[PDB]
Amino acid sequence: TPEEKLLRAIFGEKASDVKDSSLRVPNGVSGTVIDVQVFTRDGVEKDKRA
Amino acid sequence: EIGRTTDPVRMYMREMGTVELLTREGEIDIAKRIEDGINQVQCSVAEYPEAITYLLEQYDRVEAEEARLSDLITGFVDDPELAREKFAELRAQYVVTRDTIHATAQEEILKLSEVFKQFRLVPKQFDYLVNSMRVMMDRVRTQERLIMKLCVEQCKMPKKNFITLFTGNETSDTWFNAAIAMNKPWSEKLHDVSEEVHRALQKLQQIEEETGLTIEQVKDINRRMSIGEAKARRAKKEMVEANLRLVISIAKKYTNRGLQFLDLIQEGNIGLMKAVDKFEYRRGYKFSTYATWWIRQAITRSIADQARTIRIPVHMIETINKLNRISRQMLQEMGREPTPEELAERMLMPEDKIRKVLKIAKEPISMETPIGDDEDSHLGDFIEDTTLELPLDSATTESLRAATHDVLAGLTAREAKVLRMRFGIDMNTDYTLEEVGKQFDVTRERIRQIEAKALRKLRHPSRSEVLRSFLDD
Amino acid sequence: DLRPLVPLDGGRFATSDLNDLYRRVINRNNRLKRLLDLAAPDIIVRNEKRMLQEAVDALLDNGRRGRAITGSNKRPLKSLADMIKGKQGRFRQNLLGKR
Amino acid sequence: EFDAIKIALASPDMIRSWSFGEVKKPETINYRTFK
């Protein structure tokens, strides 16, 4: 929108091409993580934690 | 005899089960009849000298290094230049025939038809020139309507005698004009329509000019044309209405590709038409083997065309069908099922186009799919619009508008104007700094320093800290 | 946007059945024009006009015809008048009482 | 704003009025792009 270009020009921050869509715990729920599995597409190279 | 039904496949099977199928050599005589129809049309073509000269014009044109001869002729019954020698023959024959301004004219026209109609002619050339002949028929019929309107229903001519002098003269100024002094109810009524009928006669005599043979013959040519056309269309109906059942068989071959039964039947039926118009009888060969590939390709192009609600081309559906064949082969030759980077050897594709092809193959879901447990909540009740904006977003945007408004209030006039012209604040599209210097008629670099100074002041603590508070980073 | 084709995760699509019914009608109509262009025997044009009549009739109600033309799945298509009539139409459901 | 709601038949002139185009082909999307 106009004028957010204005604000960003007055402060000069980066319009990062990446948008946050990270899985978060739902609201109210408050537990403890007890197992974290990671699947992969076999063409994909595995990450660190996987 | 039957009660009723709706079931349009029912009415179709009914109406197609009237005709008996065929009898061998009956089909060959039907193809004989269709050859008779093309015969009469080509004959009526060749007996038209204007069409002959048109053909000659096109011939030289394509022979002038403008197109291949196939754009001229689909060959003759012979390398090329056979057409060139044939055109030399017909050129000499036509010049000798126009050298008879009634000594050898009709014998020459029969000779010209028998010297060019021997081998072949282009279908598209045929259509263009026959539509030209129908243009001549347009002028014929329009002259008819003009001279009938201007004679009988307008001022009460007797149409019997009206054509009775049309039969015999048809073009001059006595079969109409010598009527005008007949002293009848109409004869003393043709004096206000005299000029229009006069000019109409002039255009008919121009028809005589632009055709050669007599205007009655100019209508007789396309009359034989139409008669041959009926001769073809009749018994073409016989052939197709016979083999509709053949169509129905291979139509049933494809019943669950996402395209209803009668759609497949009609597609195969169009294929059957295209086969019959191209079918040869002289091959001494069975018709059904010729119609089968045609109907198959037609129906298959249909099912690749409009089966899915998202059209993918023939090549993608052929690749998909090959992958389905190769998987239904490989599941047992391996035992359980093939994985995408296993078909890299069974098929020779890049092993990622397989990925995208497997991605594309699925069909979309009906938005009223009954979701589980049989509640009436369908998938439609679960599709959110990710295009609307949150009202928190709207309030943020408008409050941001206000904040910048009262900030820019805290500046001069030229600074605020420069910042509403440089950024598109409360205005149309953002002005350029070139347009800046165009509207203030000023120094570019000094204006850039103006807005840098504005930015510097806007950096000020206790002056824009709420503004950076708008920055949610 | 009233018969949407929103995208679903992983490349599937969610269409409304009005899209399928419109596509049926457009296919059959264009084929009818392609038939009149070649001037087929009256049997085929009669069949095609029957097919068009049935297609428009189903797009209007998808009833009144014995076997309502089911979708890909073996369920009947929710026709246009099946967005008005009844306990699931707009009237009793999304106009009188809203979420 | 408006006192009443009226209903009637719609002549083909009317349906040509509402129509901002003539749908001619069964395509919906482009299977690679989604335009």
UniProtKB/TrEMBL annotation, chain B:
Subcellular location: Cytoplasm
DNA-binding region(s), chain positions: 433-452
Primary localization class, coarse: cytoplasm
UniProt keyword list: Cytoplasm, DNA-binding, Metal-binding, Sigma factor, Transcription, Transcription regulation
Keyword Metal-binding: yes
Region named Sigma-70 factor domain-3: 318-394
CDD domains xrefs: Sigma70_r4 (cd06171)
UniProt region (Sigma-70 factor domain-4), positions on chain: 407-460
Residues noted as binding Mg(2+) in the record, renumbered to the chain: E465, R468
RNA polymerase sigma-70 domain boundaries: 263-276, 432-458
Region (Sigma-70 factor domain-2) location: 239-309
Motif (Interaction with polymerase core subunit RpoC): 263-266
GO aspect biological process, one term: DNA-templated transcription initiation
GO MF: DNA binding; metal ion binding; sigma factor activity
Cellular component per GO, a single term: cytoplasm
Quaternary structure and partners: Interacts transiently with the RNA polymerase catalytic core.
NCBIfam families, alphabetized: PRK05658.1, RpoD_Cterm, sigma70-ECF
Similarity remark: Belongs to the sigma-70 factor family. RpoD/SigA subfamily.
Annotated protein name in UniProt: RNA polymerase sigma factor RpoD
Gene expressing this chain: rpoD
